[PDB]
Amino acid sequence: KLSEQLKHCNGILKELLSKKHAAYAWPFYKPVDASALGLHDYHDIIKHPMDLSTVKRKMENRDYRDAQEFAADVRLMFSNCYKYNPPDHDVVAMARKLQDVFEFRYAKMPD
């Protein structure tokens, strides 16, 4: 059983995983496979990896106790992208676009 605010969070999560946003959301679907992508410095730079499949598992397991906790993981995911990558990288442009979707809908949280 999810609170009203956590149902809004679950709605946002479903939207971020939906075909509507797939053109720029796909790098965030699964944990970064550093070894597969040849990013051998990734886990030296990013101490707390996060991705939408991990957010989905935590939501399904009722790990998040409130909207703030959910938003902290979604923002951690974007912050990791902005920390690791040069600001002109294609993946950063995709992060910016998905974060715009997130922030504008998160701002419509019911009181």
Ligand X SMILES: Cn1cc(-c2cc(C(=O)NC3CC3)cc(Cc3ccccc3)n2)nn1
| Type of residue numbered 8 | H
Among 17, 34, 76, 91, binds ligand X (CB under 6 A): 91
> Residue 98's closest CA among 7, 51, 28, 46?
28
What's the CA gap between 86 and 111, in Å, rounded? 37
CB of 39 to ligand X, least distance (A): 6
CB of 72 to ligand X, least distance (A): 17
How many chain residues touch ligand X (CB under 6 A)?
Answer: 12
- Contacts with 97 (C-beta within 8 Å, 6 or more apart), sequence order: 21, 24
Q: Which of 14, 89, 100, 104 binds ligand X (CB under 6 A)?
A: 89
16 binds ligand X (CB under 6 A): no
By the rule CB under 6 A, 54 interacts with ligand X: no
CB atoms < 10 A from the CB of 101, how many?
17
Residues that bind ligand X in the complex, under the rule CB under 6 A: 27-28, 32, 37, 39, 81, 84-85, 89-91, 94
